[PDB]
UniProtKB/Swiss-Prot annotation, chain A:
The gene is cpcG1. This is Phycobilisome rod-core linker polypeptide CpcG1. It comes from the Bacteria. It comes from Nostoc sp. (strain PCC 7120 / SAG 25.82 / UTEX 2576). Belongs to the phycobilisome linker protein family. Part of the phycobilisome, a hemidiscoidal structure that is composed of two distinct substructures: a core complex and a number of rods radiating from the core. The chain holds residues 2 to 162 of 279 of the full protein. It is found in: Cellular thylakoid membrane.
Curated annotation (Swiss-Prot), chains B, G:
The modification N4-methylasparagine is found at residue 72. (2R,3E)-phycocyanobilin 1 binds at residue 82. The gene is cpcB. It comes from Nostoc sp. (strain PCC 7120 / SAG 25.82 / UTEX 2576). Heterodimer of an alpha and a beta subunit. Part of 2 PBS rod complexes, the conventional PBS rod and a photosystem I-specific CpcL-PBS rod. This is C-phycocyanin beta subunit. Contains two covalently linked bilin chromophores.
UniProtKB/Swiss-Prot annotation, chain C:
Associated with the phycobilisome, a hemidiscoidal structure that is composed of two distinct substructures: a core complex and a number of rods radiating from the core. It is found in: Cellular thylakoid membrane. Residues 5-57 form the CpcD-like domain. Rod linker protein, associated with phycocyanin. Linker polypeptides determine the state of aggregation and the location of the disk-shaped phycobiliprotein units within the phycobilisome and modulate their spectroscopic properties in order to mediate a directed and optimal energy transfer. This is Phycobilisome 32.1 kDa linker polypeptide, phycocyanin-associated, rod. It comes from Nostoc sp. (strain PCC 7120 / SAG 25.82 / UTEX 2576). Belongs to the phycobilisome linker protein family.
From Swiss-Prot, chains D, E, H, I:
NCBIfam families: phycocy_alpha. It is a peripheral membrane protein. One of its GO terms (cellular component) is phycobilisome. This is C-phycocyanin alpha subunit. Its main location: membrane. Heterodimer of an alpha and a beta chain, which further assembles into trimers and the trimers into hexamers. Part of 2 PBS rod complexes, the conventional PBS rod and a photosystem I-specific CpcL-PBS rod. The keyword Thylakoid applies. InterPro entries: Globin-like_sf (IPR009050), Phycobilisome_asu/bsu (IPR012128), Phycobilisome_asu/bsu_sf (IPR038719), Phycocyanin_a (IPR006246). Belongs to the phycobiliprotein family. It comes from Nostoc sp. (strain PCC 7120 / SAG 25.82 / UTEX 2576). Keywords: Antenna complex, Bile pigment, Chromophore, Electron transport, Membrane, Photosynthesis, Phycobilisome, Thylakoid, Transport.
Length: 138, 172, 57, 162, 162, 173, 172, 162, 162
């Protein structure tokens, strides 16, 4: 509800095909080992092949997936999770330490699911990657 | 996220033995006292919004420079900031009494709390004067018997107040 | 990815943006559910494409 | 990790709201069944040593080649039979763990997570372990509603195997 | 919409897995409270007309200026008092709706969603409606565990008001 | 897209590829001359912006009273806050149109796909334009009233302020 | 997502009246018949993987060109494709018996499934020959008179089989 | 924070380009407007103490029950009346702050941000503060174009209240 | 019996005159008092099993000798404790009677007439029921409105015991 507190941004340097795309989405978020056998979801794979669900929409499911929550959300601290969340979708470590902290309080109020939805909504994130393109390092 | 049921599994996995019979007699008392635990939880959440402002009638009246010009609770967004997360203490303390173990609370609510509270500039010690004022009002509601069958939930009252004392220790 | 089944199909005509990298194909449908439909119509209009049809599903 | 008390929390936490009566109601349901679930834990813990060697010699019956073929994977060597009672004895631990937790969480996190990766690499056929678990669910001697209770989690490990 | 049977579904659907015993635990638990929750629905439906006019004349007591000040928003003339029993009578509907659903869902979707937006625009102070609901929770005449049951959802509407 | 009075007389002048004529500059000189009135007038709409919407909602719902009665699409409380969430967005973009002086910023947001959602959702589309007319009856009543302001003819702005509401009612009904 | 409890609310909201006493006597039978639903539901999910391959062999043994070279179940990811969503029928039919109303079934298996099955080129009618073979095995397990206690599950069995018939009608 | 000089910067910064002549025009506008805006600041600062006690006794007129009803929230005893002149005296500060800034920024950041959250919790009805601000905009005695200048920001706080 | 309706009747009877406006104003004082009182009786009838369990256990903890001393008058045997819940179960009826009647009529006619007469004979100490009613005075759960009217009848019975 309330507008985000203004945080300073540190200067940064950064500032078969179908099957591969699914793997790429999985790879950035799960770092290879996590996909395993259990983490993979049949419905998400079907939607991409089906194309009913957009890639931007596809990632949200992975971000909000139960397997992801147990592995990262539960174990890690809220502040760490905000920093942790940034690498996979944004692809960039947060420039300002204070900014990361500001994000964490918001994450707690809306939950893990709430924070992920917010990242997609932000103008910088959509513009940087695009709906069609899988998230990549910046 | 751990429990009373799951934490007595997790150390029992680390030693790799079957669960003993006196651990199951321990958990049988946890089930037995479960009904009492549920009743206490519902009274806190039903009086959840009434606690926070009644703590804010004393959190700001006792240290009155905080809302006076200059204090960190002065302007209106800043004032709504220490009601947006005065309740998050109650949002996770009630999760701790539900789970029955403070491991849920430690991971999110207090893990990074004492670091932001010197990065922002807010008085960290001026939080734990009023979280104690929440505990004085929380155990007053949870113990009072109104339209309830007589029962003894004293053990919960002391370790309900232990969750507030853990909530005040890692901020101060 | 919508808490409930309330999905409305959207058809945009001509999307202007960086046209090679950002929008490689215009006149395609976007399948957004009920919760973000407030947000989605503001996203389309920022590029400048106009909506043809909005069909539920 | 997955527990009906945990599932009430993680549902209400992602919404950012308090514990409603719908999360609280779920907890109440767990207690009625947790009284009969701890009955199933003592039935498996007391009969633990009979059930392991009852199982690891039942799998040798239906698969007699597993004690004969010379392979690292095979249990024909004593070292395999030492790792036989370890592996099947690991199953009754996690089944008893998921009994007292009430959920499939400890079964989901300790046993079946990444089981398709490990059985392909070491060539352990999952038809072996499902034959031992059918022996356990028929020979635990449990009765009543507690006999239903162990029978779900055993059969839940069966479906995750295949 | 939020229901303990629904909350078992939407948790298991986002995970892409079947219904485990942890989703299925809640349903068993829910029936036991649903037996006492439907007791609370008949207690409010039968005493419905006593409770509405018991409430809309109790709010006139604590706020006597609401019948005196000439405003579209205030209940000065008969048109406000006609919209008085409509609004307070809308509350006992949704409270009885969330009783038989077992969750706060119908209360969350019909009543309190966007209530801060509407009370700011029409200048309806939310201190009025919380005074009527305190009259309802003390004068429904319900007893036993069913008296606890209506008392949560009334108090849940109180906290969402303030 | 976003056009103006200043920029639209450029954009057709680019399409014909000629220099701007002197009678177009005498036209724009009247726009600068009549320009000050629009700002003062438009400040009156935004200062009474929240007062218009509920006073339109005292008649949008009183005239068609089943809408908030059980069954109508303005019945429940988030549904009611939904037609105050975007009753003001009509005023949010009509005031952008009077500021720009041309309705080309109005037709991308309130007129573009609005008639498509209003049969996808199930809301009565014609029951919007009964009350956007009730906004126009209150908007030009405030913008014309001369209170503590020097008096000059404001007729050109008022007639075509009401033309923006009529365009806002035509593409919904 | 609707229920038996929530759908008798949703039409009762559309008429705007209080819930009648004979609707509450109807729901009281639903709570009374509630325990049976869980027992039926747990037996299906515990034999969930055993149904699909047993249902599956008949599905391919009766129409044997499908896995023979040329059919749409021929290659190996194509074969794993009609086991990755043979179970999704069981994933949502078990959601329908849990909710007690088929309104959660018709958004996932019945909504756009007949549209993909034409564009895809996979036979649509060759699905509903084997979903009937699932129903022949599902009600055989749910109605088996083994363990628990004898009771009347006939009402549930007939409208358990009604969910499979709705699952076969919108594909064929 | 929101200022016409700031709004020229944040528009040109997100594009990554220099200051064009279009960014400059917004800044140019402020100087002519800002000459008449500082006229409105001295008109409110010099008449500050007349306007506060002129306002906090005008709200007691239209709402006489606010001095009579005993509650922490109401201004029954002297402690409420001490917090009366604090709160209404806070409004004339931020109105004078947003005058000299030229934008609504200090009004947007100090006063109205999260005002719906605070007035719901402490049950302060926003109809009280809008009655004081109507007294200020009619009794500041300002004339000319400066009388228009304070009249926007007062009315901007009115719309954010309701 | 005594009722402020019949108090107006029996007063006008002895003078032999019609019901003037003197006796008529005593009626509407009884009428609008019932709204508070009727609710005040509903708070006691719903909590019937709570208070007679609460007051009986409060007597034993206050006077620990009354459970141990051998005698018919005391509560050593089972039929004493059976007569314990009968007596305080008989007090709560008349308080609900005298709240509904709106006067001290049923307290006069059914409880306190000859109440000091019997307690000298059966050596029942009146201070037993003083502490019994004082538990009901603190634990009835009704606050304000009818409860204040309701409480007086508890205190009117205490002064009749002493
Ligand atoms: C807005 C604040 C800001 C700054 C300043 C910034 C700088 C920045 N400078 C970079 C590289 C670089 N910067 C230079 C700069 C220089 N070489 C010289 O000899 C000169 C002394 C000097 C410039 C005056 C060079 C040569 C590279 C490329 C180095 C390499 O690729 O090895 C890079 C990595 C590549 C890239 O441009 O993305 C970043 C991110 N980023 C920011 O966000
Ligand atoms: C889930 C557990 C959790 C908690 C509790 C938490 C607190 C927390 N409070 C913060 C700020 C704040 N905290 C407060 C609270 C206070 N300051 C005062 O003046 C009062 C004395 C006191 C309240 C009693 C305020 C006013 C801010 C905003 C300060 C700023 O923006 O600089 C911040 C940094 C910015 C933010 O995101 O909002 C965090 C991370 N974060 C967490 O993740
Ligand atoms: C999740 C929804 C839910 C709730 C809320 C719930 C509460 C609940 N509390 C109960 C009992 C009880 N609850 C209490 C609690 C207390 N007594 C005191 O004097 C203490 C101050 C306090 C604890 C601090 C007591 C003493 C009992 C007696 C019966 C028992 O042991 O369960 C029971 C027993 C069965 C019944 O009352 O019908 C219920 C239902 N059950 C539910 O299904
Ligand atoms: C590899 C597959 C592929 C193609 C081919 C492709 C083409 C392509 N050309 C575009 C635009 C355009 N393409 C043209 C092309 C021409 N106009 C003329 O008059 C000429 C005769 C002609 C060039 C010879 C023009 C003028 C535009 C801009 C249209 C506009 O701005 O409205 C756009 C969108 C606007 C943009 O971002 O620039 C796309 C997607 N995108 C793809 O992904
Ligand atoms: C805590 C839960 C848990 C279990 C149960 C588990 C089993 C497990 N058993 C393994 C191997 C093995 N498993 C067996 C067991 C058998 N093979 C046979 O021939 C018999 C039929 C059967 C026993 C009845 C044997 C003999 C090996 C060694 C095979 C090899 O080295 O290739 C391996 C791979 C190598 C290893 O670390 O030892 C795992 C991961 N791991 C786990 O984390
Ligand atoms: C289904 C659940 C539901 C409820 C309860 C509800 C209430 C509700 N009451 C309203 C107005 C109102 N509400 C009241 C009621 C009151 N004002 C008073 O003076 C009395 C103190 C009090 C009654 C006891 C009045 C008189 C109005 C008209 C006020 C106006 O027109 O400004 C409005 C705004 C205008 C409207 O459509 O009529 C809503 C949305 N809406 C809902 O969707
Ligand atoms: C900026 C251009 C723009 C507009 C206007 C817009 C409108 C819009 N109106 C919506 C719903 C709605 N809008 C209304 C409006 C009304 N109900 C009535 O009876 C009245 C006639 C009317 C209010 C004056 C209602 C009731 C809904 C929700 C209906 C429902 O969900 O059942 C939704 C659905 C989801 C959401 O709001 O987030 C959108 C996206 N979106 C846009 O991008
Ligand atoms: C009731 C019908 C009516 C209107 C609408 C009206 C407006 C109006 N505004 C005027 C002036 C003006 N109006 C403004 C207003 C503003 N300038 C800014 O930069 C600010 C953003 C804004 C105030 C927020 C200004 C600055 C002037 C300059 C002349 C003057 O002081 O009157 C004048 C002076 C005479 C003229 O322009 O011919 C008129 C006529 N007169 C009427 O008879
Ligand atoms: C009779 C034996 C048989 C089966 C079983 C069969 C199934 C089948 N389902 C397919 C596709 C599919 N099936 C689904 C189904 C779903 N996805 C979801 O997320 C939903 C929850 C669910 C529907 C409720 C989807 C989405 C596709 C994508 C491809 C297509 O449109 O066909 C395809 C396309 C070709 C392939 O996968 O190789 C096959 C083969 N084909 C056969 O010959
Ligand atoms: C063959 C036809 C048939 C069926 C289907 C059947 C089921 C059945 N399940 C019962 C009980 C029950 N069934 C369950 C099952 C469960 N509760 C949960 O919360 C778990 C998730 C789930 C197991 C996974 C439970 C808990 C009971 C309680 C009563 C008992 O122990 O039997 C009973 C007891 C008698 C009755 O309900 O009238 C019946 C009849 N009886 C029959 O004759
Ligand atoms: C810097 C901008 C700023 C303002 C203006 C502000 C107001 C403000 N006034 C408050 C209470 C109050 N506000 C008032 C004022 C009034 N009540 C009445 O009865 C009168 C009608 C009216 C004055 C005309 C009173 C009496 C209280 C104390 C109420 C209570 O303690 O419950 C509170 C909550 C408790 C507090 O800290 O004192 C805030 C946050 N806070 C801010 O940060």
């Amino acid at each position: 509800s309330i507008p985000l507190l203004e945080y300073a941004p540190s200067s940064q340097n950064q500032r078969a095909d179908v099957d591969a795309i699914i793997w790429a989405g999985y790879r950035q978020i799960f770092s290879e080992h996590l996909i395993i056998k259990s983490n993979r979801q049949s419905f998400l794979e079907s939607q991409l092949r089906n194309r009913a669900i957009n890639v931007r929409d596809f990632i949200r499911g992975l971000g909000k997936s139960e397997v992801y929550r147990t592995q990262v959300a539960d174990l890690n601290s809220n502040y760490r999770l905000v920093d942790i969340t940034l690498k996979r979708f944004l692809g960039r470590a947060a420039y300002n330490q204070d900014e990361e902290i500001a994000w964490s309080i918001v994450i707690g109020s809306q939950g893990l699911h709430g924070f992920i939805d917010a990242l997609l909504d932000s103008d910088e994130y959509r513009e940087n990657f695009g709906d069609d393109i899988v998230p990549y390092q910046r | 996220t751990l429990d009373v049921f799951t934490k007595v599994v997790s150390q029992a996995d680390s030693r790799g033995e079957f669960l003993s019979n006196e651990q199951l007699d321990a958990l049988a008392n946890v089930v037995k006292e479960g009904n009492k635990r549920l009743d206490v939880v519902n009274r806190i959440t039903s009086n959840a919004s009434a606690i926070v402002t009644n703590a804010a009638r004393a959190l700001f009246e006792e240290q009155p420079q905080l809302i006076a010009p200059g204090g960190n609770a002065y302007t209106n967004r800043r004032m709504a900031a220490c009601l947006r997360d005065m309740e998050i203490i109650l949002r996770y303390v009630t999760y701790a009494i539900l789970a029955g173990d403070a491991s849920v609370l430690d991971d999110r609510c207090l893990n990074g709390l004492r670091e932001t509270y010197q990065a922002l500039g807010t008085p960290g010690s001026s939080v734990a004067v009023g979280v104690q004022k929440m505990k004085d009002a929380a155990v007053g509601i949870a113990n009072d018997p109104n339209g309830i069958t007589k029962g003894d939930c004293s053990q919960l009252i002391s370790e309900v107040a232990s969750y507030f004392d853990r909530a005040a220790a890692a901020v101060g | 990815v919508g808490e409930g089944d309330r999905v409305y199909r959207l058809e945009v005509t001509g999307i202007r943006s960086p046209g090679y990298p950002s929008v490689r194909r215009s006149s395609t449908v976007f399948i957004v559910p009920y919760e973000r439909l407030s947000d989605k119509i503001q996203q389309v209009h920022k590029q400048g494409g106009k909506i043809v049809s909005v069909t539920s599903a | 990790v997955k527990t009906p008390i945990t599932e009430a929390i993680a549902a209400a936490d992602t919404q950012g709201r308090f514990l409603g009566n719908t999360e609280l109601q779920s907890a109440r349901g767990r207690y009625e069944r947790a009284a009969a679930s701890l009955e199933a834990a003592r039935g498996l813990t007391s009969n633990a040593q009979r059930l392991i060697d009852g199982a690891t010699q039942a799998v040798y019956q239906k698969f007699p080649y597993t004690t004969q073929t010379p392979g690292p994977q095979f249990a024909a060597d004593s070292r395999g039979k030492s790792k036989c009672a370890r592996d099947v004895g690991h199953y009754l631990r996690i089944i008893t763990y998921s009994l007292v937790a009430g959920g499939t969480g400890p079964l989901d996190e300790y046993l079946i997570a990444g089981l398709a990766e490990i059985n392909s690499t070491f060539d352990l056929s999952p038809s072996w372990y499902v034959e031992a678990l059918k022996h356990i669910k028929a020979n635990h001697g449990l009765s009543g509603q507690a006999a239903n209770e162990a029978n779900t989690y055993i059969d839940y490990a069966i479906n995750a195997l295949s």
